[PDB]
Symmetry: C2
Subunit: 273 residues, 2 copies
């Protein structure tokens, strides 16, 4: 709840506004980088899915010879289901990329509106920066008339030409005195505007980081959901292997590849006929 | 029960030849199991090395933005995921070793079994040699009786009858001997085949139970890593919860803050 942005963005240069504003704009970078990360994760998931699909094809094309042969269909169906799980994660990640891209383009809208809203604080910054430089110029000019006043005074000059040098110091004093009052006015305006705007930026940054973590939340949800499905494919495979018993494998081999039930007949002595 | 004994006889008696070659096909099932685990490990390693590459790319994103520190959470979690899949690769490579060790010791027991029931192979060669010779003598003895009938219907000499009778007598003596030798070989084949077909089923039982034990070890290895993968997903969720909005706001403000102190007070200063 603490105002970190208000407390930490002042300094002598009055550049805090600039930093904060461009930091808001850098929030666009993060959205592009996140989408790119999810795209690459989806690439890996699809590579895995396509290879698993190919692994199921090779499982169906194994030799039909032997008692174990029918078990490859249990390998086929499970590998097909596992491959489909990963492809569905790809689809879910791709839907997630779409809503990151959607957030990225509504950032551009809300950044444009913030720019138009902080226009008063932009003025407050450039006026205080201008007056601080103008005050320094009037400070140095005031001192330049002091040195020239005392240069002519200590060396020896007419009281008429000293008095007109004193008036040149008076106008140098008055304008410097006026800039001191102008600084205090611009300083009070800047501090009032910056405190409202530094908080404004922090609030924008909090809304940003909340929405981003919600996307990573949906990222974690899709991965967890598919992870649960993957675990169910493994368990289905386990008990399908349990159901495929040795008894049934021998049963099916004898019934299909058995030569004959009836044993060779008994032949006796035959008459000539 | 006994399916191999009951259902492997037939007229041509291919029973032994089929069951022996089927035992040999048990070696193919072992090779194809190795090829499956190897291909699965290849997929699991490619995935792992891609994830490692993804984990390292997570750190090479922009330093700009309040979100920046969150990338380390991605980096550490994606690294751990990558290592889980490589650990499975190592476990699957240990299975390929025991499958091929089982495959090479199958060759040892199969050649032993061949030498154990070579007598039953002889019994198949014996009954086939005899039944053909029994049919040869059956056709012969009947032809001697056809000649006995042919020469009687036409009429011949009494001494030719003695010659045809003694030829039919020896045709009977051999044909009757082949009937006894068939019944002796049938009682030898059916006795040995029943013992051999039961032996072929018993060794096929020990084959199928051991192959299922290896696939059991396969399912265990995948289940164990799947549990670890689920823990990484939960650790990622936790680390994301720990990386609060407040901690990121504080991170950036103290890193890229322009100054704690507000613009200074400037008053008149006399020369």
């Amino acid at each position: 709840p603490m105002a970190y942005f208000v407390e930490n963005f002042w300094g002598e240069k009055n550049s805090g506004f600039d930093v904060l504003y461009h930091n808001m704009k850098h929030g666009q970078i993060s959205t592009k980088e996140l989408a790119d990360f999810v795209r690459e994760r989806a690439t890996i998931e699809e590579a895995y899915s396509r290879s698993m699909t190919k692994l199921a094809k090779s499982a169906s094309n194994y030799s039909q010879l032997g008692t174990f042969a029918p078990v490859w269909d249990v390998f086929k169906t499970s590998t097909e289901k596992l491959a489909n799980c990963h492809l569905d994660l790809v689809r879910k990640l791709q839907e997630l990329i779409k809503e990151v891209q959607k957030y990225g383009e509504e950032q551009v809208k809300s950044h444009k509106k913030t720019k138009e809203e902080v226009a008063g604080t932009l003025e407050a910054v450039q006026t205080i920066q201008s007056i601080t430089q103008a005050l320094q110029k009037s400070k140095e000019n005031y001192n330049a008339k002091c040195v020239e006043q005392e240069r002519l005074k200590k060396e020896g000059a007419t009281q008429r030409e000293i008095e007109k040098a004193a008036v040149k110091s008076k106008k140098a004093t008055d304008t410097y005195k006026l800039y001191v009052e102008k600084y205090a006015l611009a300083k009070a305006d800047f501090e009032q505007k910056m405190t409202e705007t530094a908080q404004k930026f922090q609030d924008i940054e909090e809304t940003h980081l909340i929405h981003i973590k919600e996307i990573i939340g949906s990222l974690s949800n899709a991965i967890k959901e598919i992870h649960l499905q993957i675990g169910q494919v493994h368990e289905e495979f386990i008990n399908n292997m349990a159901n495929t018993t040795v008894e049934s494998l021998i049963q099916k081999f004898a019934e299909s590849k058995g030569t004959g039930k009836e044993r060779p007949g008994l032949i006796e002595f035959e008459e000539c006929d």
